[PDB]
Design a protein around this nucleic acid. Structure first.
Ligand SMILES: [Mg+2]
Lengths: 49, 1337, 79, 148, 50
DNA sequence: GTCCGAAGAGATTCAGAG
DNA sequence: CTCTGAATCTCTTCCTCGTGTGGTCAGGAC
RNA sequence: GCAGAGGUUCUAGCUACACCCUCUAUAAAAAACUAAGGACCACACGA
């Protein structure tokens, strides 16, 4: 993964039970963007006529 | 459309009636042409057409031609949906056996033909012949003979003797047998053959015969001669890739059956030799077996990928079968899923909802709104508009979700609080947002948890969701009166930080002009949040009939506490907020608001309390710094002391002074004491670490160390947890449980060594594996319980029965575990609950025990009320309202129509996750010494020794409340007499832990009558004093000489006569058991109450609850006597010892072969009572019920299961167990038919015989006598009159076969049955509909 | 909009009869031509039925009265 | 060692800073821990788990996704869900779920056409999965009849 | 950039993540200490000794 | 174009004792 | 000796959902 | 709009869940439009 500044305090319940509260700074600097490669197979079968 | 389900055996004529043709071609559809074969397992001609209103050929493609068979292709032009209803029959070349009857557990073919199942299999599978109409020859009609025997019998008689072979033979035997004549003859010999084993077997066979002749089905129909097929669409060819069209794992089974049948038909057409036709018919029978259930006999066939074929019984039984996967748990439309998160901005009746999935959910609603508003004209236009998600779609969606609740749902739902509803608010993102407070009920964890969301559609269903599902309507959990919407972990920490005090803070001692001024001060920073001040609050108490008083007064309080006074509605006192407000305090505050101001102010609370808790935990900055976890400087010194002590013990063992076990126990105890000292030092350093300046001198108070704040407040973390964090980790066990001699010295703040971490991992992995297996077994137990109590629905306002339960506070040796307050809260008094003074009806016999009444009971010295429990009810098909008291989830008595069975089974099974699965008598406090079932004997010394076995020492106070109780062992010496008032902290009794002393009732000389030296006794040497003490030899291990005579010790007077007990003519002879070390001689003067001899003297988790509710008799059960009288050893232990009971009034029929392997604490001369433990052990529930009544078995079972639950701290009210027990012993056993019609050995439903007796007593003809039979739930649910309910649960084959042969009929009247059939359930909003339906009928 | 149902159940105090009566009332107000006898505030038929109940105006016997009044008015124009 | 490394940098030894609030702009009392935890990012994203179905495919038993809810299939109102629903008394909601929302194809399409017209009626019908069970347990000689 | 929930530490006893947090803070302190004397140019001797 | 473990619970056998 | 009991074998059920990854499913001869 | 066919488009469109008009044996003045769809076992896991 990556590493970023972390502070342990209840911040208005958004991190209520176990939830993380990541800043918009993480998304803004493209910190955690992950490439996902999907595959779409397609075949050509011996159909009659 | 109907009201019942009929079951029978389809004769080989109604099979033809169903079947629209005979399948003759094993071929399915051709690979080349999709069109099915002429007469294959798929065939448009003898089934439905492939396409709607189109025949197989192109002759009648046009829909114009309707309902006309096409002449060109012989295929109808009906709609293709009919391909799911049409059937086809396989005309078997020879009859074949039905597996569901052959080699089955019910073994119907075995009872019916009165043959061994082995022999029936042998004849059917063609191993051996069976004879029919033997006649003159020695072979009867029921004999089984081998092939060589067949040749010999053919020699005996050429033709008159007949031995048909195979299934045809069984068919012929069934034909030759006549039910009615056989049934009455079997009744005749049942009346005479009194052998208990023969009685059981004959009752089984006669029950089968009677239920088979009275039901409209002949016995020939067991042997299926015409197999039907599934409709082709219910058994299709799915794919098109790879291997074009694969199979359904059933088409191949039917093809194999068809191929075997065709080959057998060809052989019969060619008259092949009898051996090869025998082989062909045998493998045809085997193929039919595989089709019926592939795996009931031998190697389950397989020709596709080396796995057993999914036979028809496979598709019905088990989880994967239709009953469970596809009927009770149908996947639903208008549903969605997403990992959930927390949103504080939401209210309590609200939940977040992604716009994407909300749009994907309410698409029909969006279409309807768009069509109404004119933004589109056709469903195509609306689909395009919503697929483009125009801005005109979003504001319409927010219009349609104005008041439309959605059912949020967690996947592993256990209690009914696991699926609530909310008004969804449209928000961005991909995650449903759940209110924090409603995560405690959901058990939501917000770590990637996914919750299903469901949308009610019909306005009745939306309204029902609003009235019942919505979270603001089910705040009170049905498990206990403790509210379930409780601030869980973060908001409570914030409140604790708010509502606290430090003796020095900015602006302390200021005087405030109201809580608003306190908020103004804090938000301006002038005064610290938890500074001490004096405010002017205005409490609003309600002393009138619903009106409030404006009581204004000053309160020495903290600014933070004053902040919360703007959050409470009027009707609460200030003392509810003037404290620290930890976790229990906040939960009690919510409960007090619910019980005072109602429900709406309580929801207002929940929401606002969450808001303030978050908003001030934010400003709290409740960090976790490592320096917030102070290491005790005392702890290192304590560790040095423990090391010195363990070194001393170890070096003592190095000299052999102590033993290995003694050294182990001593080191374990010293390390535990060191751990306790470390814990105490850690606390005494941590909970007061703040040493603050008190305007001058120095003062110390409760510390603000963030870890201690999060632990002490109850937010997150227990005292033991923080101890194992900061102080010692204590010790920890090996895999088995024996703990290590060397504990974990270090902790988690400082480093942890490698070996210590390995020892920790032992227990960590143990607990983790246990919790996974726990969730598995707990889910299974929850299903079992909810399927044994599914049909119990409250259906009457009152049963009108005085019978109840003598409910009392539980005292199992210790103090009170459940006081009478929370025990009978929310229940209904059974009889006239009086007060200590007699002739004073303190409580009427029909008044609900709510808060006021139970409070009045305590102050007026209550000890024993009677409550009309559900197990004491009498209404058939569900308990009454007053038999159940409050619903306990709402603030009133149960509504007539609730489904208390399901709610109770869930409330029992839900704490399964919280439930894990892997001396002297000294009095305590003030009170007297009273005993029941007591036989105290005053010895010559003046003390008290008791002969009674089940004598109970109870410490009743000066009022009558039994505060302490203690069991009294036999012969135990007591301090003071019965009823005597003792002091506190005093010892009152003790005994010899491994010695039951033979006490004396009248003093005098002793004579060793019937005591042969050497044989019956051994004058074994006294290796300490020399004077040999006699050891009474048991008749088993003794020699062959004295085995006839029994040991005895008879008292004699000055003349030598027989001294006897006053009242009983039998003399004062004290018989002896084996290994009885008697340290006396004959003629030794003893006292009245002196000792005479010396005789030497299991799971507590989820398996305990499973064993209880399964009614499993333990492997070592305590044996009790069903009749009161004198104990004796009748036979000379000839194989086993005997116990014969002789009551004075009644006769003395008794004989019990107690295994010669138990310490029978009861001697051989004592009048035991009906229901006394002659041996000792876990008392099985069956004999408990049959020897002490239903009101005793229910008390025992509820007490034990609650003890298992109270041990883990989970609170369950006893009604949720009493209803399970009522559904658990709803079966009776007839003891006398009387004027009714019930066989003796019959085991029929209790409600049925109760109704029969209640209708017979309307006349003078006597009814029937019964004994309620406690059945384990796993086969109490399987014994219900309804059959589909049992079929869904377990053993679908067994119950289906039993219903079929009996011709059983289902009169649904149940929750699961209606769920399967899909109509309204007769419990809830559909209860009125079902009561109207049963009113019309 | 509304949050709770206690003020509604308190007069229909079975908590199940409430569902049935408010459901049939919301039916007559949604598929029927009946207009809400309680003011509407951009609220769906369900909360409107609840509001009509809480105002002490719509109950089971009142619904039966309305049904038979409609029946009488229907059969009066058929004679 | 970690304390000395902290003190080498111009950082507090206690490891806690005084984080001023981002909104109120006021000091947080009880100074809070601040540091660089190495946070991962688990593969269990949400956009591959944000599922919802209005009405899509159906099976031989007329269950929507049957084997795999990945083919735009609805959630499974599982075995425990009907218990947790009938415990309340949601007969109408339960009847919805297991007859007209999932199984009764005639009733399902009728209620679809009903809902697209503002009306929210409902027709019980016979659960087609129950008809499948009926035909199966009737296809083995055990006669079953919806006798009235 | 991230605000964890403190109350997950005591119960879910993973106090290591706070040691990790403090050590990460010290590591970033070293990083920015050398960044300052590298952002504004300081000779190789001072940076090398630090 | 067409066709050949574990856990319990119950049903069922041995035995051993009258 | 035959029947209450000892054993013996055998059969059913074991959280409930998902994300998904795949693997699998009737020929040549007349 | 319920049993068929035709129409201006685009082979075919008769409510098939389905979209416009005509009549009961005859085919065109006319723009928005179209397809009813798919089973069983092993594995990585996740709450
Ligand atoms: Mg979780």
């Amino acid at each position: 993964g990556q590493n970023m500044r972390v502070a342990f305090m209840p911040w208005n319940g958004y991190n209520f039970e176990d939830s993380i509260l990541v800043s918009e700074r993480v998304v803004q600097e493209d910190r955690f963007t992950t490439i996902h490669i999907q595959e779409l197979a397609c075949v050509s079968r011996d159909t009659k006529l | 459309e109907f009201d019942a389900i009929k079951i029978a055996l389809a004769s080989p004529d109604m099979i033809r009636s169903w079947s629209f043709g005979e399948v003759k071609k094993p071929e399915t559809i051709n690979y080349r042409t999709f069109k099915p074969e002429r007469d294959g397992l798929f065939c448009a001609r003898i089934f439905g057409p492939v396409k709607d209103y189109e025949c197989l050929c192109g002759k009648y493609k046009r829909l114009k031609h309707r309902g006309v068979i096409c002449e060109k292709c012989g295929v109808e032009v009906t709609q293709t949906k009919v391909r799911r209803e049409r059937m086809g029959h396989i005309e078997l070349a020879s009859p074949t056996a039905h597996i569901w009857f052959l080699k089955s557990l019910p073994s119907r073919i075995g009872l019916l033909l009165d043959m061994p199942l082995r022999d029936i299999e042998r004849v059917l599978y063609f191993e051996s012949y069976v004879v029919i109409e033997g006649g003159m020859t020695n072979l009867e009609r029921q004999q089984i003979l081998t092939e060589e025997q067949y040749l010999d019998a053919l020699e005996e008689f050429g033709d008159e003797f007949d031995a048909k072979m195979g299934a045809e033979a069984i068919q012929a035997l069934l034909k030759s047998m006549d039910l009615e004549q056989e049934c009455e003859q079997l009744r005749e010999e049942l009346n005479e053959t009194n052998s208990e084993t023969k009685r059981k077997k004959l009752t089984k066979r006669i029950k089968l015969l009677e239920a088979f002749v009275q039901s409209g089905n002949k016995p020939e129909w067991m042997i299926l001669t015409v197999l039907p097929v599934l409709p082709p669409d219910l058994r299709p060819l799915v794919p098109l890739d790879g291997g074009r069209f694969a199979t359904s794992d059933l088409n191949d089974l039917y093809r194999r059956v068809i191929n075997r049948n065709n080959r057998l038909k060809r052989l019969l057409d060619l008259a092949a030799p009898d051996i090869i036709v025998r082989n062909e018919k045998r493998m045809l029978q085997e193929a039919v077996d595989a089709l019926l259930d592939n795996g009931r006999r031998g190697r389950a066939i397989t020709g596709s990928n080396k796995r057993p074929l999914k036979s028809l019984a496979d598709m019905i039984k088990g989880k994967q079968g239709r009953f469970r996967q596809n009927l009770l748990g149908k996947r639903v439309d208008y549903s969605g899923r997403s990992v959930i998160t927390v949103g504080p901005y939401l209210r309590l009746h609200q939940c977040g909802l992604p716009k994407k999935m909300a749009l994907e959910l309410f698409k029909p609603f969006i279409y309807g709104k768009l069509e109404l508003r004119g933004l589109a004209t056709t469903i195509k236009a609306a689909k395009k508009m919503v697929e483009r998600e125009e801005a005109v779609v979003w504001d319409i969606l927010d219009e349609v979700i104005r008041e439309h609740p959605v059912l949020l749902n967690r996947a592993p739902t256990l209690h009914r609080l696991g699926i609530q509803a909310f008004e969804p608010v449209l928000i961005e993102g991909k995650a449903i947002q759940l209110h924090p407070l409603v995560c405690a009920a959901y058990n939501a964890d917000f770590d990637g948890d996914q919750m299903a969301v469901h949308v009610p559609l019909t306005l009745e269903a939306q309204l029902e969701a609003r009235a019942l599902m919505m979270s603001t309507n089910n705040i009170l959990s049905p498990a206990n009166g403790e509210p379930i919407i409780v601030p869980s972990q973060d908001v409570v920490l914030g409140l604790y930080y708010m509502t606290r005090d430090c003796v020095n803070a900015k602006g302390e001692g200021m005087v405030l002009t109201g809580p608003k001024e306190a908020e103004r001060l804090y938000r301006s920073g002038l005064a610290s949040l938890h500074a001490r001040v004096k405010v002017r609050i205005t409490e609003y108490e309600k002393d009138a009939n619903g009106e409030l008083v404006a009581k204004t007064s000053l309160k020495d309080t903290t600014v933070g506490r004053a902040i919360l006074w703007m959050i409470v509605p009027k009707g609460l006192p200030y003392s509810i907020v003037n404290q620290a407000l930890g976790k229990k305090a906040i939960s009690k505050m919510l409960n007090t608001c619910y019980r005072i101001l109602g429900l709406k102010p309580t929801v207002i609370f929940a929401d606002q309390i969450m808001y303030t808790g978050f908003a001030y935990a934010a400003r709290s900055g409740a960090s976790v710094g490592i320096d917030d976890m102070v290491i005790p400087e005392k702890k290192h010194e304590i560790i040095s002391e423990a090391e010195a002590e363990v070194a001393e013990i170890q070096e003592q063992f190095q000299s052999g002074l102590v033993t290995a076990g003694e050294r182990y126990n001593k080191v374990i105890d010293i390390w535990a004491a060191a751990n306790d000292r470390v814990s105490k030092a850690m606390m005494d350093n941590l909970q007061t670490e703040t040493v603050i300046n008190r305007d001058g001198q120095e003062e110390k108070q409760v510390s603000f160390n963030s870890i201690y704040m999060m632990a002490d407040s109850g937010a997150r973390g227990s005292a033991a947890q923080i101890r194992q964090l900061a102080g010692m980790r204590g010790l920890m066990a090996k895999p088995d449980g024996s703990i290590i001699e060397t504990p974990i010295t270090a902790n988690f703040r400082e480093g942890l060594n490698v070996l210590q971490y390995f020892i920790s991992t032992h227990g960590a992995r143990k607990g983790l594996a246990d919790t996974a297996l726990k969730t598995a077994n707990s889910g299974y137990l929850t299903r079992r319980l909810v399927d044994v109590a599914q049909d119990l629905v409250v259906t009457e306002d009152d049963c009108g029965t005085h019978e109840g339960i003598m409910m009392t506070p539980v005292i199992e040796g210790g103090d009170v575990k459940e006081p009478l307050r929370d025990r009978v809260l929310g229940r209904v008094t059974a009889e006239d609950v009086l007060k200590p003074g007699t002739a004073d009806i303190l409580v009427p016999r029909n008044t609900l025990l709510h808060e006021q009444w139970c409070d009045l009971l305590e102050e007026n010295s209550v000890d024993a009320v009677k409550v009309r429990s559900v197990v004491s009810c009498d209404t058939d098909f569900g308990v009454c309202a007053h038999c159940y008291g409050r619903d306990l989830a709402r603030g009133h008595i149960i509504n007539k129509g609730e489904a208390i069975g399901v709610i109770a089974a869930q409330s029992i099974g839900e704490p399964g996750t919280q439930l894990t699965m892997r001396s002297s008598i000294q009095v305590k406090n003030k009170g007297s010494i009273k005993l029941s079932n007591v036989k105290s004997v005053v010895n010559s010394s003046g003390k008290l020794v008791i002969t009674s076995r089940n004598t109970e020492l109870k410490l009743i106070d000066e009022f009558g409340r039994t505060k302490e109780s203690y069991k009294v062992p036999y012969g135990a010496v007591l301090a003071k007499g019965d009823g005597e008032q003792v002091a506190g902290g005093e010892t009152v009794a003790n005994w010899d832990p491994h010695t039951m002393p033979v006490i004396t009732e009248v003093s005098g000389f002793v004579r060793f009558t019937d005591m042969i030296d050497g044989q019956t006794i051994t004058r074994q040497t006294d290796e300490l004093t020399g004077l040999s003490s006699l050891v009474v030899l048991d008749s088993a291990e003794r020699t062959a000489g004295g085995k006839d005579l029994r040991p005895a010790l008879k008292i004699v007077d000055a003349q030598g006569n027989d001294v006897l007990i006053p009242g009983t003519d039998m003399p004062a002879q004290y018989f002896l058991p084996g290994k009885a070390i008697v340290q006396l001689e004959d003629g030794v003067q003893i006292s009245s109450g002196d000792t005479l001899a010396r005789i030497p003297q299991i799971t507590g988790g989820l398996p305990r609850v499973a064993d209880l509710f399964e009614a499993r008799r333990p492997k070592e059960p305590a044996i009790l006597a069903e009749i009161s009288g004198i104990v004796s050893f009748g036979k000379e232990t000839k194989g086993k010892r005997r116990l014969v009971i002789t009551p004075v009034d009644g006769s003395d029929p008794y004989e019990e072969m107690i295994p010669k392997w138990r310490q029978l604490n009861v001697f051989e001369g004592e009048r035991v009572e009906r229901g006394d433990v002659i041996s000792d052990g876990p008392e099985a529930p069956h004999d408990i019920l049959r020897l002490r009544g239903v009101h005793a078995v229910t008390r025992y079972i509820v007490n034990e299961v609650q003890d298992v639950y109270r041990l883990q701290g989970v609170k369950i009210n006893d009604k949720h167990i009493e209803v399970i027990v009522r559904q658990m012993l709803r079966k009776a056993t007839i003891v006398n038919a009387g004027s009714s019609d019930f066989l003796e050995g019959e085991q029929v439903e209790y409600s049925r015989v109760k109704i029969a007796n209640r209708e017979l007593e309307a006349n003078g003809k006597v009814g029937a006598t019964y004994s309620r039979d406690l059945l384990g739930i796993t086969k109490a649910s399987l014994a219900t009159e309804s059959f589909i309910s049992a079929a869904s649960f377990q053993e679908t084959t067994r119950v289906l076969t039993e219903a079929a042969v009996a011709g059983k009929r289902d009169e649904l009247r149940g929750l699961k049955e209606n769920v399967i059939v899909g109509r309204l359930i007769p419990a809830g909003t559909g209860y009125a509909y079902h009561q109207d339906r049963m009113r019309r009928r | 909009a509304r949050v709770t149902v206690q003020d509604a159940v308190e007069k229909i105090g079975n908590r199940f009869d409430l569902v049935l009566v408010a459901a049939r009332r919301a039916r007559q107000m949604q598929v029927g031509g009946k207009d809400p006898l309680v003011p509407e505030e951009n609220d769906k038929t369900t909360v409107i039925a609840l509001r009509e109940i809480e105002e002490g105006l719509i109950n089971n016997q009142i619904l039966d009265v309305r049904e038979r009044q409609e029946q009488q008015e229907q059969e009066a124009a058929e004679l | 060692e970690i304390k000395e490394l902290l003190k080498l940098g111009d950082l507090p030894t206690s490891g806690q800073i005084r984080l001023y609030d981002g909104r109120t702009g006021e000091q947080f009392e009880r100074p809070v821990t601040v540091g660089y935890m190495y946070m991962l990012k688990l593969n269990h994203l949400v956009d591959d788990k944000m599922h919802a179905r209005s009405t899509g495919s159906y099976s031989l038993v007329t269950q929507q996704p049957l084997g795999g809810k990945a083919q735009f299939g609805g959630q499974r109102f599982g075995e425990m869900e009907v218990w947790a629903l009938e415990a309340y008394g949601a007969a109408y909601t339960l009847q919805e779920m297991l007859t007209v929302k999932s199984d009764d194809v005639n009733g399902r399409t009728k209620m679809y056409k009903n809902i697209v017209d503002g009306n929210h009626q409902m027709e019980p019908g016979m659960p087609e999965s129950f008809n499948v069970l009926l035909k199966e347990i009737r296809s083995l000689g055990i006669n079953i009849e919806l006798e009235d | 950039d991230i605000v964890l929930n403190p109350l997950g530490v005591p119960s879910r006893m993973n106090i290591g993540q706070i040691l990790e947090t403090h050590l990460g803070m010290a590591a970033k302190g070293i990083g920015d200490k050398i960044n300052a004397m590298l952002k504004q140019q300081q000779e190789v001797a001072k940076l090398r000794e630090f």
